[PDB]
User: Fold this.
Amino acid sequence: SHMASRPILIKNFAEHYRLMSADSDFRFSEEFEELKHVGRDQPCTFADLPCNRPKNRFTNILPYDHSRFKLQPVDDDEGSDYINANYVPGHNSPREFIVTQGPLHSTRDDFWRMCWESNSRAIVMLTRCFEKGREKCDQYWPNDTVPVFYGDIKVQILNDSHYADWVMTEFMLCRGSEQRILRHFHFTTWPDFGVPNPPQTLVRFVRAFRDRIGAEQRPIVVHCSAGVGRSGTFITLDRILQQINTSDYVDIFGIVYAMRKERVWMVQTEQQYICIHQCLLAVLEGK
Assistant:
């Protein structure tokens, strides 16, 4: 049924791609345009509160109420429960991901509290802190081995591994004698404009991530800067790469539709929407 879904037979994907990208992406552009109002009629009440106003990077990027992540209230604070974040469905769970903005210095304590309260064991970062001299994300994690306290959460690097396009970091998370291990997967190679090119570098990261994390039962935290365009791209990519193992179909459109209902602008540009397709084509063609 084709209002909120366009499944494509994998064996036909290459032709679908060709048809969709023909004539300067006419069909791709048409298809993506269909998603523009999806979700946008939903209230963003708490995001709009005066006490939460300073907690959002962008006035136009706000978590829907029905979907937002709620921090535990702290005695006598308006909005101590608020963070710019939303549960977003994945391959394995309707609440598999929590997607959020790049924390501000103002909000990183909240960010870490969320990681802790969510019981997340994995963060995916799809931005550099600075791009073209603009700050897109606070440096919310230590730059060495000396543990740093963010609110009640103590964070400490156990080790890190650098790669061509990402840095992997293993944190010890401590909180009043309770101890966890969390992994941080940081794609550091996204270009200053456009999408990764060749797209294969992103596939490599998604593959490296999923291979390492496994069938995670707990929420995975995902962010770029606004936590919509790049975050939306990575998730869609991670789903469909799993999907092609157990199905004859892929529904990129249906996936993006569903994400939209849960967080604004999930895959944000038509260029990222076409990019997801290009990554998958690379996979189905043996790169």
